[PDB]
Ligand binder design. Structure first.
Ligand SMILES: O=c1nc(Nc2cccc(Cl)c2)oc2cc(Cl)oc(=O)c12
Lengths: 108, 107
């Protein structure tokens, strides 16, 4: 495992997974459970932290940028789908700011 | 810093000349663009012209602060526009380049 992917796993995912605002993002969006019948009409590439974490655990990624794009898709899906005023947007913004702060110190 | 230099000369330069970058090179002009609700929804406007000027004038203390402004710029687009708007695709395309280039920044 590259230095970069080790960092994404040990530093970035570690910080984000345990965060108090992480829970809406720890599993795929369940549109039935959440009452969101248009979710998959709007969001064509669902992504969540559970998936990213499993991919890090299973050496799915070849480059760190690939993992970073998955985090990015997760956050962007939230901004695109939700109303600007929804609390979930605030939660995503908070997590993404940590993501970027940590990525500023990633190797290589 | 070494990182701020990189964000200016490597990251911003690449984004700036991109064929999808023209809506992002200057602040959103809500009057000229006919967006009467833009500043009621978007409370922290950001654009690449502003970031570039901040880079030129040594406004940033750290690389992360600059990266946060890029992020705010893209996030504003996703929040304000309709999912089906072309500008969302343009922002997505630019943001993927941003993250690719950031992955190679000096640690
Ligand atoms: O991305 C999202 N993730 C979640 N997770 C979630 C939500 C409630 C319970 C549990 Cl266990 C998980 O909920 C959402 C609700 C809405 Cl409205 O928009 C969203 O984009 C998301």
């Amino acid at each position: 495992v590259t230095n970069q992917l080790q960092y994404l796993h040990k530093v970035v995912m570690k910080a984000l997974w345990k965060h108090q605002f992480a829970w809406p993002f720890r599993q795929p969006v369940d549109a039935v459970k959440l009452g969101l019948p248009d979710y998959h009409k709007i969001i064509k590439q669902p992504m969540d932290m559970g998936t990213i974490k499993r991919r890090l655990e299973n050496n799915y990624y070849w480059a760190a940028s690939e993992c970073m794009q998955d985090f990015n898709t997760m956050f962007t899906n939230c901004y695109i789908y939700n109303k600007p005023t929804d609390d979930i947007v605030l939660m995503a913004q908070t997590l993404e700011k940590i993501f970027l702060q940590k990525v500023a110190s990633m190797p290589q």
